[PDB]
């Protein structure tokens, strides 16, 4: 079980990742719980910053995005100059 | 090369499918062109009506959704009592 911190500088426009999941999308048959990184762009900030496809997003700038809805997660990622993500890689 | 017509009765609320692609999402690396069915619900109207995962949506009630944007396709599917889809299964 691994847990990593990703430092993505914000205000850089395109980030280079894609997310799925949420505490509401766990009903319509992801089968595991949580938000997950589904794509990392080759030249993406998230890819070079360490973020990998499959990483569950546990926290965003201190927030506990874990067990949050999909749109809650999108909002938590868009609103925050310094993007501090805590992600899981189990 | 196959082309099928799917008759989905509208005004039935949840349809039971999911779409991807578009004439604008062909840039950020689907690699083929067009809109595609990515999920068909087990009890879904689209599943029982014949729609399969992988089917490209060529037309919606006569429209040529082919080579259309993702949101153009969503709108073309949501706006129309009788949903007439022409889809490809190649």
């Amino acid at each position: 079980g691994s847990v990593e911190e990703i430092r993505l500088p914000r205000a850089g426009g395109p980030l280079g990742l894609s997310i799925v999941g949420g505490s509401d999308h766990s009903s319509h048959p992801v089968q595991e719980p949580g938000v997950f990184i589904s794509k990392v762009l080759p030249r993406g900030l998230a890819a070079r910053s360490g973020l990998r496809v499959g990483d569950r997003i546990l926290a965003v700038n201190g927030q506990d995005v874990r067990d949050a809805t999909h749109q809650e997660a999108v909002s938590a990622l868009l609103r925050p100059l310094e993007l501090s993500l805590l992600v899981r890689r189990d | 090369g196959s082309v099928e017509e799917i008759r989905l009765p509208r005004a039935g609320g949840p349809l039971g499918l999911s779409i991807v692609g578009g004439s604008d999402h062909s840039s950020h690396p689907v690699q083929e062109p067009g809109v595609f069915i990515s999920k068909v619900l087990p009890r879904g109207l689209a599943a029982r009506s014949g729609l399969r995962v992988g089917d490209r949506i060529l037309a919606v009630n006569g429209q040529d959704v082919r080579d259309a944007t993702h949101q153009e396709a969503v709108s073309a599917l949501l706006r129309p009592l009788e949903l007439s889809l022409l889809v490809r299964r190649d």
């Binding site: 997310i19 794509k39 749109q71 | -």
Partner: peptide, 8 residues
């Protein structure tokens, strides 16, 4: 009519 995947 529900975002199942969001790119950023």
């Amino acid at each position: 009519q529900e975002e199942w995947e969001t790119v950023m």
